[PDB]
Amino acid sequence: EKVEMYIKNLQDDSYYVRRAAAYALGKIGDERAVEPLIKALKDEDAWVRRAAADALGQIGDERAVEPLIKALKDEDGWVRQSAAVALGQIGDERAVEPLIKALKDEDWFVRIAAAFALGEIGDERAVEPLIKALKDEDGWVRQSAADALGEIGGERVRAAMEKLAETGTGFARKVAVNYLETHEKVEMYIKNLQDDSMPVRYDAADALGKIGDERAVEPLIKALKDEDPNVRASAADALGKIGDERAVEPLIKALKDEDGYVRFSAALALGKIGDERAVEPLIKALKDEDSRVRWSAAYALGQIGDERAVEPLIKALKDEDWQVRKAAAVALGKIGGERVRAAMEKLAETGTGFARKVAVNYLETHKS
Ligand code: NA
Numbered sequence: 001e002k003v004e005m006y007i008k009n010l011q012d013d014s015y016y017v018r019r020a021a022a023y024a025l026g027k028i029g030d031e032r033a034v035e036p037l038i039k040a041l042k043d044e045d046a047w048v049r050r051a052a053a054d055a056l057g058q059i060g061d062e063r064a065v066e067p068l069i070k071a072l073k074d075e076d077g078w079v080r081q082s083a084a085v086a087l088g089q090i091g092d093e094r095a096v097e098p099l100i101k102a103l104k105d106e107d108w109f110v111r112i113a114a115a116f117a118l119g120e121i122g123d124e125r126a127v128e129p130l131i132k133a134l135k136d137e138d139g140w141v142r143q144s145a146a147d148a149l150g151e152i153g154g155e156r157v158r159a160a161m162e163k164l165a166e167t168g169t170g171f172a173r174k175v176a177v178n179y180l181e182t183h184e185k186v187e188m189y190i191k192n193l194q195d196d197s198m199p200v201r202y203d204a205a206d207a208l209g210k211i212g213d214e215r216a217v218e219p220l221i222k223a224l225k226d227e228d229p230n231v232r233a234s235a236a237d238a239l240g241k242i243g244d245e246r247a248v249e250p251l252i253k254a255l256k257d258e259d260g261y262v263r264f265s266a267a268l269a270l271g272k273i274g275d276e277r278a279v280e281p282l283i284k285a286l287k288d289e290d291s292r293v294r295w296s297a298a299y300a301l302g303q304i305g306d307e308r309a310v311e312p313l314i315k316a317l318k319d320e321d322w323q324v325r326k327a328a329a330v331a332l333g334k335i336g337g338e339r340v341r342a343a344m345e346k347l348a349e350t351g352t353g354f355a356r357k358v359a360v361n362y363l364e365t366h367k368s
């Protein structure tokens with residue numbers, strides 16, 4: 001109930017209250033706030049745009065990727081660096097080519113952020129752009145590319161490190177020679193899913209979801225019954241990114257978890273997969289104790305687009321939580337069947353307040 005005022009305050013006229021909202025959503029915000037924070041990326045105030053990219057990477061939702069890639073072309077350097085780090089935290093391979101361009105940004109601190117991000121994504125296409133970045137005019141940028149090639153650490157880098165230590169000059173030689181003096185991936189994290197340490201398990205589910213290989217589906221389904229609820233919800237989000245329809249039934253069981261964030265993550269993942277078998281469980285999830293879970297129920301029903309949720313969403317237009325109603329109005333707009341039209345004209349004349357307000361709105365938009 002702290003989140004929603006920050007979400008409303010993101011569109012406030014004053015630039016200072018926008019900053020305080022984006023600032024606090026970077027600390028508190030969850031998946032409910034990326035659609036408003038994606039709009040905040042278009043702000044007038046560079047401080048707002050910066051803190052927004054800061055928050056979208058901290059939330060780690062894959063829908064911020066195409067926005068943050070255009071934020072890489074922002075006029076403020078400190079905004080481009082916040083989008084670089086944010087895309088590094090999301091780990092989406094679509095940022096690799098534009099981050100390779102940011103590896104040659106006019107500002108030194110953006111090149112550092114671009115090198116870091118490509119290191120955290122671990123895509124091998126950055127290996128030679130990072131190798132040539134070892135000759136950058138700025139030593140701190142050279143140092144960041146050395147660390148970025150270390151995080152990737154394929155044999156493509158051992159190849160380039162050997163060629164560099166045999167042939168290179170200056171810092172690039174110092175890096176490669178030390179590389180030799182001190183020294184596939186999806187299979188390591190699957191085994192890490194069964195680790196005794198909780199952060200290792202969590203990191204494993206975080207990693208397998210960004211990688212997106214469907215071999216990690218069955219192991220992540222088993223992680224849905226993990227002892228810790230952070231691993232449970234992480235494997236749920238990972239299964240949603242993977243999109244494999246094998247996790248549909250075990251995710252529906254996750255809709256009945258003790259932890260509300262696990263149910264919240266299970267609902268969003270079932271909307272990503274889009275299987276209609278989620279419609280019935282998600283509909284009864286609109287009546288959940290947790291206002292977040294009620295929100296993820298409506299949003300997922302909007303992603304699926306099944307007309308069986310029309311009237312449950314009309315019901316949801318009178319939720320106590322503000323953005324649960326906001327999500328329900330969005331969901332009826334996505335579905336938009338002939339049933340939705342008939343339901344909202346009844347609501348236009350018989351409704352009250354917010355439900356009436358959005359019923360009139362829907363009829364206004366869908367006219368031509
Ligand atoms: Na900031």
